[PDB]
Amino acid sequence: SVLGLLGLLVGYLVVLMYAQGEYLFAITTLILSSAGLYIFANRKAYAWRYVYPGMAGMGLFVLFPLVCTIAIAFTNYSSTNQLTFERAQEVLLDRSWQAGKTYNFGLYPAGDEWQLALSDGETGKNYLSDAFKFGGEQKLQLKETTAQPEGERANLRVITQNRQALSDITAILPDGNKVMMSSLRQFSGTQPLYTLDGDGTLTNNQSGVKYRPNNQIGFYQSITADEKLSPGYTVTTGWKNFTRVFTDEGIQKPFLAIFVWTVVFSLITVFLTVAVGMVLACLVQWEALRGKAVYRVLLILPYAVPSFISILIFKGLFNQSFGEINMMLSALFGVKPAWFSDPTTARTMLIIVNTWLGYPYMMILCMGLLKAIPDDLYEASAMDGAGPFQNFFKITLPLLIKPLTPLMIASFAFNFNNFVLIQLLTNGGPDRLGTTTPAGYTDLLVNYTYRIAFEGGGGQDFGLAAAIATLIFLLVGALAIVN
Amino acid sequence: AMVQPKSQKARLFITHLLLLLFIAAIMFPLLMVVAISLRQGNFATGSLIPEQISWDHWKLALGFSVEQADGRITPPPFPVLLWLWNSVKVAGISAIGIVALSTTCAYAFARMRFPGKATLLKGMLIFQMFPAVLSLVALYALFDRLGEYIPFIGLNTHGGVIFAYLGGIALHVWTIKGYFETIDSSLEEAAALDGATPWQAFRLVLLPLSVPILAVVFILSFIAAITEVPVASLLLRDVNSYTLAVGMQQYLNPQNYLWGDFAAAAVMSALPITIVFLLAQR
Amino acid sequence: ASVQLQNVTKAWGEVVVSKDINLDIHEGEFVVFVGPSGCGKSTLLRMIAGLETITSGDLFIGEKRMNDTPPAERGVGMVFQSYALYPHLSVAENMSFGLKLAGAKKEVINQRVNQVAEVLQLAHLLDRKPKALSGGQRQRVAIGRTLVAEPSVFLLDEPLSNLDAALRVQMRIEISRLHKRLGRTMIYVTHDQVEAMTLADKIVVLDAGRVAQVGKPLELYHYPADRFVAGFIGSPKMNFLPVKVTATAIDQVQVELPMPNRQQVWLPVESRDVQVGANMSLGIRPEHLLPSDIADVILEGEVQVVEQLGNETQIHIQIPSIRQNLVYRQNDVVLVEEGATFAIGLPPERCHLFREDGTACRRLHKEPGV
Amino acid sequence: ASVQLQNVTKAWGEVVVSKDINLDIHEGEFVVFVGPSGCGKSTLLRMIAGLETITSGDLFIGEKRMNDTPPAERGVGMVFQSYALYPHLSVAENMSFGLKLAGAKKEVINQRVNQVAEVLQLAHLLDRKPKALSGGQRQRVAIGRTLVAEPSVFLLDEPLSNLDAALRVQMRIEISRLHKRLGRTMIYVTHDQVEAMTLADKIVVLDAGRVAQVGKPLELYHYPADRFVAGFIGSPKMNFLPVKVTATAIDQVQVELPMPNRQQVWLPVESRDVQVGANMSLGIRPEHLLPSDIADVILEGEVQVVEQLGNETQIHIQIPSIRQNLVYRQNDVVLVEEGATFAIGLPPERCHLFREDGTACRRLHKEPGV
Amino acid sequence: KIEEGKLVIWINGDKGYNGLAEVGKKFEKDTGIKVTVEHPDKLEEKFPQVAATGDGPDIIFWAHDRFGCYAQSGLLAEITPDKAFQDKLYPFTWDAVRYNGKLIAYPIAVEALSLIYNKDLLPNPPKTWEEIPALDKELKAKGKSALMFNLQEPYFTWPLIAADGGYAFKYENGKYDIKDVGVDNAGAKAGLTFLVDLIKNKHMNADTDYSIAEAAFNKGETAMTINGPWAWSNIDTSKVNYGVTVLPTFKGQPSKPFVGVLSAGINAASPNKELAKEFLENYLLTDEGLEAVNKDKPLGAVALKSYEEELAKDPRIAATMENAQKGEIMPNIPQMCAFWYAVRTAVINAASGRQTVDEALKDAQTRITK
Ligand SMILES: CCCCCC/C=C\CCCCCCCCCC(=O)O[C@H](COC(=O)CCCCCCCCCCCCCCC)COP(=O)(O)OC[C@@H](O)CO
Ligand SMILES: OC[C@H]1O[C@H](O[C@H]2[C@H](O)[C@@H](O)[C@@H](O)O[C@@H]2CO)[C@H](O)[C@@H](O)[C@@H]1O
Numbered sequence A: 001s002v003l004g005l006l007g008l009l010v011g012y013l014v015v016l017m018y019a020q021g022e023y024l025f026a027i028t029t030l031i032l033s034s035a036g037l038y039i040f041a042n043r044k045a046y047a048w049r050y051v052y053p054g055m056a057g058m059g060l061f062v063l064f065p066l067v068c069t070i071a072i073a074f075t076n077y078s079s080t081n082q083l084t085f086e087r088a089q090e091v092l093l094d095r096s097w098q099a100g101k102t103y104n105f106g107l108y109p110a111g112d113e114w115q116l117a118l119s120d121g122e123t124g125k126n127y128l129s130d131a132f133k134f135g136g137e138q139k140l141q142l143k144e145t146t147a148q149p150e151g152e153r154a155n156l157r158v159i160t161q162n163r164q165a166l167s168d169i170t171a172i173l174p175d176g177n178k179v180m181m182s183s184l185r186q187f188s189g190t191q192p193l194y195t196l197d198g199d200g201t202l203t204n205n206q207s208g209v210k211y212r213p214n215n216q217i218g219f220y221q222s223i224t225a226d227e228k229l230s231p232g233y234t235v236t237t238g239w240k241n242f243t244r245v246f247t248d249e250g251i252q253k254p255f256l257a258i259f260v261w262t263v264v265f266s267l268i269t270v271f272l273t274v275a276v277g278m279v280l281a282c283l284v285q286w287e288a289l290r291g292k293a294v295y296r297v298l299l300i301l302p303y304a305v306p307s308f309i310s311i312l313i314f315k316g317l318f319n320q321s322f323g324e325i326n327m328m329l330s331a332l333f334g335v336k337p338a339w340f341s342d343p344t345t346a347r348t349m350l351i352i353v354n355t356w357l358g359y360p361y362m363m364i365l366c367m368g369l370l371k372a373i374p375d376d377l378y379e380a381s382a383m384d385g386a387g388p389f390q391n392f393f394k395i396t397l398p399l400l401i402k403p404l405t406p407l408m409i410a411s412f413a414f415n416f417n418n419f420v421l422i423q424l425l426t427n428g429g430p431d432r433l434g435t436t437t438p439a440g441y442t443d444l445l446v447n448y449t450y451r452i453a454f455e456g457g458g459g460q461d462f463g464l465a466a467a468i469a470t471l472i473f474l475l476v477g478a479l480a481i482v483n
Numbered sequence B: 001a002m003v004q005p006k007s008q009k010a011r012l013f014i015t016h017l018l019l020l021l022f023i024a025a026i027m028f029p030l031l032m033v034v035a036i037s038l039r040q041g042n043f044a045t046g047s048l049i050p051e052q053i054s055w056d057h058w059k060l061a062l063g064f065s066v067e068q069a070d071g072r073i074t075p076p077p078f079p080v081l082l083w084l085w086n087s088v089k090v091a092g093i094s095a096i097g098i099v100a101l102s103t104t105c106a107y108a109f110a111r112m113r114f115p116g117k118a119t120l121l122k123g124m125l126i127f128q129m130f131p132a133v134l135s136l137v138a139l140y141a142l143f144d145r146l147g148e149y150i151p152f153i154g155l156n157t158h159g160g161v162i163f164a165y166l167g168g169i170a171l172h173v174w175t176i177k178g179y180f181e182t183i184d185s186s187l188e189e190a191a192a193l194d195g196a197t198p199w200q201a202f203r204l205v206l207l208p209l210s211v212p213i214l215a216v217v218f219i220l221s222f223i224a225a226i227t228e229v230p231v232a233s234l235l236l237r238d239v240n241s242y243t244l245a246v247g248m249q250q251y252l253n254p255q256n257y258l259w260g261d262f263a264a265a266a267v268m269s270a271l272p273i274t275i276v277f278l279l280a281q282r
Numbered sequence C, D: 001a002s003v004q005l006q007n008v009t010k011a012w013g014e015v016v017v018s019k020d021i022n023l024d025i026h027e028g029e030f031v032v033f034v035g036p037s038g039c040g041k042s043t044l045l046r047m048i049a050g051l052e053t054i055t056s057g058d059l060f061i062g063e064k065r066m067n068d069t070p071p072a073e074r075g076v077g078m079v080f081q082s083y084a085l086y087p088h089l090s091v092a093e094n095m096s097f098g099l100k101l102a103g104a105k106k107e108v109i110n111q112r113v114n115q116v117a118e119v120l121q122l123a124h125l126l127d128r129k130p131k132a133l134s135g136g137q138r139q140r141v142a143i144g145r146t147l148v149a150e151p152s153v154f155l156l157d158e159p160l161s162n163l164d165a166a167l168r169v170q171m172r173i174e175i176s177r178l179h180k181r182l183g184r185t186m187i188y189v190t191h192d193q194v195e196a197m198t199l200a201d202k203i204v205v206l207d208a209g210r211v212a213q214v215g216k217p218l219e220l221y222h223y224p225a226d227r228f229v230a231g232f233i234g235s236p237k238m239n240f241l242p243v244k245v246t247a248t249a250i251d252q253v254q255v256e257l258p259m260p261n262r263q264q265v266w267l268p269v270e271s272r273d274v275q276v277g278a279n280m281s282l283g284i285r286p287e288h289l290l291p292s293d294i295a296d297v298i299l300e301g302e303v304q305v306v307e308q309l310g311n312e313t314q315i316h317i318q319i320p321s322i323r324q325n326l327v328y329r330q331n332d333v334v335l336v337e338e339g340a341t342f343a344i345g346l347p348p349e350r351c352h353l354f355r356e357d358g359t360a361c362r363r364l365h366k367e368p369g370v
Numbered sequence E: 001k002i003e004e005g006k007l008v009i010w011i012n013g014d015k016g017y018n019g020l021a022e023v024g025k026k027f028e029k030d031t032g033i034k035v036t037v038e039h040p041d042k043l044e045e046k047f048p049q050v051a052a053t054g055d056g057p058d059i060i061f062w063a064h065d066r067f068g069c070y071a072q073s074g075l076l077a078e079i080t081p082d083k084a085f086q087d088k089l090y091p092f093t094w095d096a097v098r099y100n101g102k103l104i105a106y107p108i109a110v111e112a113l114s115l116i117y118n119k120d121l122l123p124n125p126p127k128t129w130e131e132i133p134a135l136d137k138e139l140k141a142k143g144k145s146a147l148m149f150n151l152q153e154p155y156f157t158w159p160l161i162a163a164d165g166g167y168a169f170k171y172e173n174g175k176y177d178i179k180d181v182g183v184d185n186a187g188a189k190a191g192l193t194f195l196v197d198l199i200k201n202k203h204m205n206a207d208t209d210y211s212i213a214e215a216a217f218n219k220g221e222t223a224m225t226i227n228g229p230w231a232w233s234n235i236d237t238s239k240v241n242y243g244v245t246v247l248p249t250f251k252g253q254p255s256k257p258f259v260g261v262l263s264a265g266i267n268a269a270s271p272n273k274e275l276a277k278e279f280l281e282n283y284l285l286t287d288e289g290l291e292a293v294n295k296d297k298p299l300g301a302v303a304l305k306s307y308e309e310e311l312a313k314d315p316r317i318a319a320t321m322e323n324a325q326k327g328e329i330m331p332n333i334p335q336m337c338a339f340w341y342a343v344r345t346a347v348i349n350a351a352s353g354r355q356t357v358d359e360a361l362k363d364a365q366t367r368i369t370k
């Protein structure tokens, strides 16, 4: 039925993976596909039909980029050393140098055919081609002439439309060297900077130097019969990145310092977000209250406003010397707290904000979870003479934590990797001094690792960041294999 | 209507005030923006309450050029509306996909017996704790190859981002699984005796009774994508394909701080989820 | 201690689910509210409890008005239909909860708990959680909880309604012996006429939020006020025959049978406010029916159902001229086939009579027990 | 349409609930599985239904092994304990859900739903949804589903379990009238022994997973095979008295009561496999006792409880010699004050006798209806 | 991958991007090719990233200093201007776009900071820096302030630092000695100390950024500010009576701002190198082109000599070139981009008060050399 048709793309795209190299993405496309066919075919595997399409997503877009990101740690992948070797040479050969002069060209139609002309500014003499036809790489020979070509010169728009075939025409003077298109009005003698023969040895065509791929550093370099070509290609470096993490002083010092802040930050968050969320959920669905329906939609508005924009509008409000918060905060009290300069005050801010962000989620959660409690428990409570505070602590609370745990342990891990908040609000907050790598006082483990990788000026080692990332995960994977 | 003691109001009245004070404290920031979006000038600083209204910021947020009596017509800098539609695309499609994937899986975990079902989900949750933010490099790589093979889901494509979000379902699977293991077994057993195939049951019986939990998952997943930043701004390069989350940051270059223009679009950006929360009144 | 209601009315906006009704309950009296589901039994109980506001009327507990008094301060106590145990609390804590809060007395608690755990056999469950117990035990935890609180009035909301039929029977007795062991006022809500007859000193029969009749069980059994009371009390339902009044004397009344054999018989009953030609219902309980060879009032038909109960025998009979299977009830075992012809006797003295509206005529036939 | 079980056994890892049990059920036979809560009643039904795997043994329905056949293909139909009415579907849809899916017949369904709703009286509710119906209507629907399905074997899991008393009784009739009308095999699960006696043609008593006794209700009542069956049937419980075997005779056995007045009575019962000095229990139902004046073996003591049932009178007496209040049960009314002295006669003929292992000594006295 | 068949230009958001886009329409009306101008945030970092992967714009706009790192990374394409073009611009502007003897960008305009003062408030702007605090007290007690400008960026505070002897890389007759750095010397320290001194005496706020400074002057809140030409476009709108003049001197030593040459490179990975060249040479770098951009936001003193003399009259541009001469041209070596990070941090930290002047600067010192 449809087995054969979708089994046609099995091999159609699969063998196209084997071809053109791509052995990285060749095995996984066939292996993860041959399971879907095997499962959806026979009926002895009816259970996996409901679990395949799900885990497929996990595999490709979650599990893969992780496994891959780990192999990144075993290499010097960096801003300097980024592309693969085959692209690095492809880039290096794509460049060129000017070895001749500049000639102003013109396009003059000759019937259905066209005609090119150049003009030498040094000698005054002009050169003209024979009636040719656009399409494909072709060489043209220019003959010297004194007369004008018949036909009105083609305007930019027309030459722009034929730029394609015009770039492949490699015209040449009788005496002068080869010359191709350089603009919409000019031809010039442009030639490839490097050439590549049998062996992977690149040779310069201007200074006449020879370069060889140094897989010790992942660059092209020269040796005496030293220079370093700096497009750069990625190459394997065993455990070099890992060993630096266990070695370096400037990396380790703040690493365990923020490990504290991260675990604390997400703890206080979870503790405050529940506290508020829950208390409200109680108050709002409390029978004797009036405008529940209004109160409800109001206390949810923060959640209906996209995080990033709320963080941003806050980022401004929390300005130290200006910004509306400290304006009013120096009106009543006589203080203007430094929410961006003082490590702690910054840390205090994060939490004031994050709490504003997270409470609705916990409240909504508690609201729904609160109805799992049969009314008659509170009726039996009110019989024994129980006040609001007595209810909350003896019935409500201890009856909500059980179903709440899995969700708050999950909320711990979310806030453990809350990248968006930090980068946006503070981006690490106040600076940590004496670090061989970029590190703030409010950076999270995700932030710190992101800093090392992408933040310009101060080392951009994707390999080192991949290492630390791998180091953390397997430790938290060990944490979750014991907790 | 149980009879209530101690003048009741003592706490009832004192609660309306606390809640009333609370909404004020949490509304403040949001009322700040609305104010900034009506204050003339694009400055970072300005009077708390505008001296006089100014529609300018809302004009070029809707796509209207505005002619100031000074430097002629200044066109809208960013296609906020476009991005707004983009955010609703990637998120909407993304969520439906995620519920489809996780409600099928949960259904198999909660009913169908197959060895390793406990150690799978356990691994699922754990593998999902790893920050997608620490992958971008490998993620960029993936959609670079995947792109030229199947075009409509590579780099610079909305589909690219969508498919990237389809990964995270571990948490959802659990919740939906947990919800199923709550429904009456009989409704299904009785269906089985009625001759319904497992799917016939899933669709005709189990799903309709689960609407609510699916709705929560959807909404949760929707808000998620709407605000997702790291991955989205990694894959989307074209301004005309930016989502809100990406583009909304181009407003606040220090040397070109479009604070007012930004504020107007910000209020606008709080529309999608609000709509969902409002339609969620079913 | 002595609870009494005066013109109590409960309405949800416009719909009146309880017309102005009064009940006089005395110190220590065992009172049962019976009736079909939703007839307001629980409403009334919950209104006395204070779990539901009294829209109109007055309520007195201990001779003081309670309408506006919080539930916890009504000197009352309740066993809930669902037991209402605290899932997160042990049996001990579940029972002690009441006084656990406000008035914490470590040494006093241990006592009262153990004391009630002794009389209810729950001492070996004090550490357990309401999830590790059986419906039967969980039901005893509910009663125990209110026993510890030692309320002046006991309120129970269908306590046995959710137990095995065998345990139910057993628990009825245990209650009666708990009642006279304490001698305090008990209000018992149930849908089982058996539970009312066997436990209640005074019975309150409710018909859709309306009190139909009040009094001793044996009084309600012989002399019902109307067709509903009659048709609600008794193991098998009372037989109702469509009759037509023919003659009228001050002593008794006469009616016509709906048979082709139009027989006539006088009934020792009230004859005030009666008219000839009025379509009435004849009331006779299966147990009171006689064998054919005794009474001269013969009723012959076809046996439809034969229920052998061992202790007794119940027989349903299709009498030619009434789409209501006449039901017979006798002792030991009756060797009779299904479908075989059968005849019974109708004792005129043991008959009830209801008017068009359904109101019963006061039986002038003195009955033993009243 | 003739279910039967051979060496059937269910297990839960290591726990062996039911030991190889055998059941032969004929065509159109109304069978009832009875026992306390959590004895296996439901599991059996659910194993016959296929909702529960069989660890060991053979299940035949219509003379073919059904152990591994999917539930839907057993010719079996179930009325669930919770009704299992699809909340999101209408009444009409609930009853016809089975034959809506897997081949539909728009025109047909209409008839089958209407016909079944005509007899069950669910006509005016077809378009309604489960959440709007009363618990009673919600049962009749749960039935219809199977009546619309018209299967060879019916399965009911405590169908009268949650209705009111009054309704529970009214339904038993509708059940039996439905049985002989359709005359198809019916397995029936209940904890109420009354329902077993009235409905069943054959009863299966279950004790902690084991099959205690199979037979007619009247056989079960007159001749229980052990203390359990005996102490599970009959309105109130059978009185059990700790007696000591003093003498044995081919024709009958003699025992000594535990009283300071150590009377001894010859009981007409199987002497086979009984020894002198053996501790045994005297079975005697409260309906079989006699007023002191008639009999010679008299038991006397103080009345603890008097239950005025109206149609009968039940009396619990504290006999000074046995910490179990003997229960007595008579007809009409018996004017007795609680705390009054009272005496009753113990008739040797109507007495059961059980050994240490609780097995019943075959009663040699012939009862009517066996 | 960069899309062929069109030009995507990236230019800093504080430049006249809209004007430049109108130069685009011209190019589209003439060639039919659509030009897209975008102004992405943090462009100096965003470009390197996207270019390396073959993505990014066709044309990149920044000051010459950054083009050295870019060219080294191989992100730029060697531009090919013939003699005729090169002579249309001042030769020293070509020197800023020369890396290893190769031309890597087309110069556009000469940028240099100046002191902008408010005439109506401050008719006599200070010549020194020391006379600012004294002036601040006066203006402060008048409800205003003295001098607000961006402290966050080093570009804005470097003038004061490099004044008394501070320097990036020491130029030794020929090439830049990437070792000899003067950000730690007595001249740099005493200078930055003064900035901190103003913060200490409440004359400035460590957190004052471009956005605040701009708002302060353009609303008449502060008397002075520091900013390049691009800033005048807004002060023009504000209708503030302002003057552009020389930067105040520190300890007799004149402010020495780094001179930026806004340039335009061609992305090494652009399939549109031919059209990119034409746009810049024949469309942007013309009189009209540059005017269109200038009439949006001031470029400064353009490199195109023809339009320079036309614009030379402007007193603001006269003072701009005056401060340029007093300061020194920005180097282009691949260490310059690394130079700015270290300074950016050093200042902010010293300005914030986390570190003192020496500690903060001694850090940046060794971060450059490494
Ligand atoms: C950081 C935390 C602070 C959160 C800030 C919230 C901001 C809003 C200000 C609100 C301050 C509380 C004021 C309380 C006023 C009393 C109002 C009242 O009297 O209303 C009460 C509502 O309950 C109720 O919230 C009972 C009242 C709850 C009191 C709880 C106070 C401490 C809670 C903190 C502990 C959190 C748990 C930690 C989790 C690990 C009355 O309920 P009852 O009829 O007894 O119950 C019956 C029904 O609930 C059941 O159907
Ligand atoms: O708690 C802080 C956090 O709350 C919300 O994040 C949610 C998220 O939206 C859900 O999908 C789920 O993962 O739970 C999270 C919280 O545990 C806010 O969206 C977010 O802004 C805030 O940081």
Ligand SMILES: OC[C@H]1O[C@H](O[C@H]2[C@H](O)[C@@H](O)[C@@H](O)O[C@@H]2CO)[C@H](O)[C@@H](O)[C@@H]1O
Residues within 6 Å of the ligand: B255, E012, E014, E044, E063, E065, E066, E111, E153, E154, E155, E156, E228, E260, E337, E340
């Ligand atoms: O501040 C560091 C920064 O200085 C210069 O950037 C200037 C730029 O020259 C101006 O045209 C304008 O955009 O202000 C910028 C600073 O805000 C250098 O060009 C740059 O390399 C350096 O990072």
